[PDB]
A paper describes a structure:
The Na+/Ca2+ exchanger (NCX), belonging to the CaCA (Ca2+/Cation antiporter) superfamily of secondary active transporters, forms one of major pathways to mediate Ca2+ fluxes across the cell membrane and significantly contributes to the regulation of Ca2+-dependent events in various cell types. The NCX is a bi-directional and reversible transporter, and utilizes the electrochemical gradient of Na+ to exchange 3 Na+ ions for 1 Ca2+ across the membrane, thus performing electrogenic transport. The f-loop consists of two tandem calcium-binding domains (CBD1 and CBD2), which exert allosteric regulation of NCX activity by binding cytosolic Ca2+. In addition to the CBD1/2, the exchanger inhibitory peptide (XIP) region located within the f-loop has also been determined to block NCX activity in response to high concentration of cytosolic sodium ion ([Na+]in).
In this work, we purified the recombinant human full-length wild-type (WT) NCX1.3 and determined its complex structure bound with SEA0400 by using the cryo-electron microscopy (cryo-EM) method. The final selected particles were subjected to 3D refinement and yielded an EM map of 3.5-Å resolution, which includes many well-resolved features and clear densities of main-chains, side-chains. NCX1.3 structure consists of 10 transmembrane helices (TMs 1–10) and the large intracellular regulatory domains CBD1 and CBD2, with both N- and C-termini located at the extracellular side. The conserved residues for coordinating Na+ or Ca2+ are accessible from the intracellular side, indicating that the current NCX1.3 structure is trapped in an inward-facing conformation, which is stabilized by both the XIP region and SEA0400 antagonist. Structural comparison between NCX1.3IF and mjNCXOF also reveals a steric hinderance between the XIP region of NCX1.3 and TMs1/6 helices of mjNCXOF, suggesting that the XIP region in its current position would prohibit conformational transition from the inward-facing to outward-facing state. It inserts into a juxtamembrane, highly negatively charged groove formed by TM1, β2, TM2, TM7, TM8, H1, and CBD2, and is largely stabilized by complementary electrostatic interactions. The SEA0400 molecule is allocated within a negatively charged cavity surrounded by TM2ab, TM4, TM5, and TM8. In fact, the pocket and passageway are separated by the TM2ab helix, indicating that SEA0400 inhibits transport activity through an allosteric fashion. The ethoxyaniline group of SEA0400 forms hydrogen bonding interaction with T138TM2ab and hydrophobic interactions with F248TM5. In agreement, since SEA0400 stabilizes the straight α-helical conformation and disrupts the local backbone dynamics of TM2ab, the association of SEA0400 allosterically inhibits the conformational transition.
Author numbering: 51 to 283, 405 to 501, 518 to 637, 654 to 720, 736 to 937
Write the structure that this text describes.
Amino acid sequence: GSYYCKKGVILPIWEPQDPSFGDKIARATVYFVAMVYMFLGVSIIADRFMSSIEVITSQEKEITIKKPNGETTKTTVRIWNETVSNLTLMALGSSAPEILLSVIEVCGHNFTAGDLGPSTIVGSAAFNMFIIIALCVYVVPDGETRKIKHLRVFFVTAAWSIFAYTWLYIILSVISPGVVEVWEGLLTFFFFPICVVFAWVADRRLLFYKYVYKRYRAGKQRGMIIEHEGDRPPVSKIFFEQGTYQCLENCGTVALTIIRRGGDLTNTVFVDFRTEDGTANAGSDYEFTEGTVVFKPGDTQKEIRVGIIDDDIFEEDENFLVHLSNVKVSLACLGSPSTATVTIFDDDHAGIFTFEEPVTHVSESIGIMEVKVLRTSGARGNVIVPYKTIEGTARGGGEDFEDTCGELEFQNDEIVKIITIRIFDREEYEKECSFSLVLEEPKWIRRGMKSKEEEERRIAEMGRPILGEHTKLEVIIEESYEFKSTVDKLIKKTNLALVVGTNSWREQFIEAITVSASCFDYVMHFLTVFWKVLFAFVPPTEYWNGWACFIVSILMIGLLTAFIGDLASHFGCTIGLKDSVTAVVFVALGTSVPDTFASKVAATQDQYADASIGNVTGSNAVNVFLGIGVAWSIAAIYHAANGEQFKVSPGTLAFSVTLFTIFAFINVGVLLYRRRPEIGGELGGPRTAKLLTSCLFVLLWLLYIFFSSLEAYCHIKGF
Ligand SMILES: CCOc1ccc(Oc2ccc(OCc3cc(F)ccc3F)cc2)c(N)c1
């Protein structure tokens, strides 16, 4: 015999209270078994609580599907919007126990500091932050990562979560060392509105900044669909070899080849060559050229060059003739076709302007659709092309798609330009629609200024921006792909033959026979038979559109956590174990089982890993802030109404807080893997990381509980 007892909230003190060790243990192990059994109860209840705080804070869209048989199906289906708020309204629900327990203790035990609220708060904080993270690391698929994306806000969230626990040390040890004074404790609650407004503004901030791709997945509820962030998915005749030459104006200089064939090649030949205007004009289009071409002993051909003048005047097709004469053998002669009609192509304009196609099919998922134009027959000169959006099958005006029009200038020598437009994510299953993107006449710009020589100049000027064929784009609005696939999967699986005559209060009861009418499941649920049956009676499903379970399951959590508080109070200090220890060791691992499942499924199911850690951070923040706020606010106010100090214990907690903060800094540190870019993403992919970081975190949690227990044993620690 080492410890006496304290009267509970519901349960009374065990009658003899001090038998031999033959009974100082049996009642203790009975207590422990009843406690783990109530922990299973609380697990199932908080499961239902989360699954009914998710029906509220969610939108339902109506979907109709035309069956090929000749009829259709019209049914509304919820789509849980996964904002940042919808993770701080389920990091809270999932942490409903560790708050209410704290509320009961101080009320139950005569408005005095019952040291099983802070101990369980810190114990569950360390347990989650060191073990749920290990699971989020080593429960992902065999090899793959879901590395965090919004690392920009994790710093703030984690620095808040760790400012929370080192604030307990602040309230009761540094401003007043042993008192939760009246003014403090009030802000411990008011700091929760800080978090809620932070969520309620930093969701909108990152909502419109991101039209990012919203992947869809199947919630484990009846018909919930969860949206989240993802990525997007024998005479030597001499003559021209060719009597006609083709070349472009931009070349300037062009080459002509003149071949001697047959006869005696050893004779040096001198042949006069000279150019003459055909349709060409010297000094404006090309330069007149003349001279002598010399063939060495043994040559077969020679090359000459003539200059061609290029300008910004888009002239018509044009040519001029080069002629040869005066063949001298110093057997050989001037070959036939000794004149080359060099013909030229002018390209000094822009010309044809046409769209890609007149019709395209684009899903609403893109949101910002980016389609191009195309130029043909040159690009010189500047243009100003109007682009108009005209409504179609659906009604535009920035309702189904952002309908705006206007004008875009195409700079000189720019072949390709791409115009954008914005598109709504109406967030609904539909079919195709249509809209139009007609083009009209651009405005031409040449040189900034805007007898036959001038008339031919205008005959050249005719080259201007003329529209091509494709001048109006009727885009087709399509259906989001993943959304279609997910709703198809769900309809093929569930949500069939539904009407509210009797949905659950008659059918939440069938689980007994529905599950026990292979051999593993038997013993897997002969401990939950009672719990499930007792949990189908009182929290009936969402008849009140979400609030038909959240107004009851909270009361049942109150009942079960009253049982937990009383039994943990009467088990600790019965075997002799200090009351605080069994929080950090025993109660914490059972009050926070829902969190583990929530984070685990979030990690293994989505594509990122910020919700799975957002859960941990939100739970750690709300536990401490809300729990101590309400419990110690009411305690301090009660002692204020008649003038007392509320002398909470400074010690027995400070060491745990400081140790947790040190270990939490180590956590946040090693979270960013050493050499991370080739030690994989956040969760998985590297065998060594995935398989040893988890063991490190488990060792850290083990050291935490071990040293909390040691400090409670001997207390000789430096604090
Ligand atoms: C000053 C208060 O700081 C706070 C500290 C902790 C808090 O708890 C949570 C922390 C992170 C959460 O997820 C973040 C998230 C971001 C994202 F881009 C996409 C999905 C996400 F899940 C949810 C809850 C809150 N809400 C505020």
